[PDB]
Design a protein around this motif. Structure first.
Motif: not given
Ligand SMILES: O=C1/C(=N\O)c2c(-c3ccccc3)cccc2N1Cc1cc(F)cc2c1OCOC2
Length: 346
Positions: A30, A110, A26, A103, A161, A105-107, A79, A151, A48
């Motif tokens: 990062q 997006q 994903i 976690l 993040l 779900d998305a940037n 985060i 995120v 990571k």
């Protein structure tokens, strides 16, 4: 004993604690991020792999500051680190550190590729502002906010993040610039409101669906600013160092477009009366973040009282108890390896 297994993800060998399985790529840009299922806690997670984090003075600085700050900052918009670990047993063999966070779900990248209502948008921006406020209340000024680094979750919740900037590397990775404040670009000194520019650069992108001021270089980036916003005033330039001030004063002058023009009504959801009222406050608030002069640009707190934003104000969310060690520092590779490993074992 032997809690680790090796697995080839992408171009990499992820050696991780057994508890984490079915790993999915994903992130590469990062850097080698990976989605997982934690069998122990029974949720999904993000891991990571910092490949050789002490390999240079920059990486070591970023990795150290990542490590400490995440340990002792608990805000719902920054985060959450859940778990740190190294596959290697000894400081001599010590090679990699894996960070395991929760976690989303998305940037934010997006999210920017889509139409949002003012409620979702006023929410995201509210949250960005909180996280930032905590950071500033703990003496941390970010200076490098960017979509790739924020995120989001399906239910509109949002996290940041990284803790941003604190000299040179050789990668196939060019650092992104479009979100950096004038006062930083011109290297003129700064205060907390500097991330307010970065917040505005995002809001405007959300709204425009195109990076406001793109640009190959710091020179080309500044063209694209004043092109839109106009040349700043006398008072402003009265502050840039003679050597910078020269370059800056001798520049094709721009009247610059007033806000309504830059951001037409076309761009806003505004067909019910609620949507129209909202749009105007979006634009009042954009008009104040996108200000070149930090002297005359909106503070973090005022932004959170703004008619658009304050519909969600929460004392607990905003004014949470402030968060250790000096962080403007110098060491060599074998000292950095020393300090990263100490911070892991803890
Ligand atoms: O949620 C994260 C995330 N940490 O939560 C995350 C991280 C991350 C998380 C924890 C620690 C370090 C990096 C890095 C990059 C993206 C992240 N994303 C975005 C993301 C999540 C997902 F489930 C699927 C995709 C996502 O983005 C690209 O499209 C596929």
């Amino acid at each position: 004993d032997n809690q680790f297994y090796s697995v080839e993800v992408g171009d990499s060998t992820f050696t991780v604690l057994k508890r984490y399985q079915n790993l999915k790529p994903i992130g590469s840009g990062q850097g080698i991020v990976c989605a997982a299922y934690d069998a122990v806690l029974d949720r999904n997670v993000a891991i990571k792999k910092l490949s050789r984090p002490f390999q240079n003075q920059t990486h070591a600085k970023r990795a150290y500051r990542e490590l400490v700050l995440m340990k002792c900052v608990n805000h719902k918009n920054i985060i959450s680190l859940l778990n740190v670990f190294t596959p290697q047993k000894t400081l001599e063999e010590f090679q990699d550190v894996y960070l395991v966070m929760e976690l989303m779900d998305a940037n934010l990248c997006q999210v920017i590729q889509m139409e949002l209502d003012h409620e979702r948008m006023s929410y995201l921006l509210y949250q960005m502002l909180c996280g930032i406020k905590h950071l500033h209340s703990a003496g941390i000024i970010h200076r490098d906010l960017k979509p790739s680094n924020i995120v989001v979750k399906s239910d509109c919740t949002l996290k940041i993040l990284d803790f941003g900037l604190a000299s040179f590397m050789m990668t196939p990775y060019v650092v992104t610039r479009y979100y950096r404040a004038p006062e930083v670009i011109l290297g003129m000194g700064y205060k907390e409101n500097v991330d307010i520019w970065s917040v505005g650069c995002i809001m405007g992108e959300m709204v425009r669906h195109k990076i406001l001021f793109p640009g190959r270089d710091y020179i080309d980036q500044w063209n694209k600013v004043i092109e839109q916003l106009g040349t700043p005033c006398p008072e402003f330039m009265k502050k840039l160092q003679p050597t910078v001030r020269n370059y800056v004063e001798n520049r094709p002058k721009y009247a610059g477009l007033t806000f309504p023009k830059l951001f037409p009504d076309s761009l806003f959801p505004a067909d019910s009366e609620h949507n129209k009222l909202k749009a105007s406050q979006a634009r009042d608030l954009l008009s104040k973040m996108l200000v070149i002069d930090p002297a005359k640009r909106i503070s973090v707190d005022d932004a959170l009282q703004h008619p658009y934003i304050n519909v969600w104000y929460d004392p607990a969310e905003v004014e949470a108890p402030p968060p250790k060690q000096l962080d403007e520092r110098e060491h060599t590779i074998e000292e950095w390896k020393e300090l990263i490993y100490k911070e892991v074992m803890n």
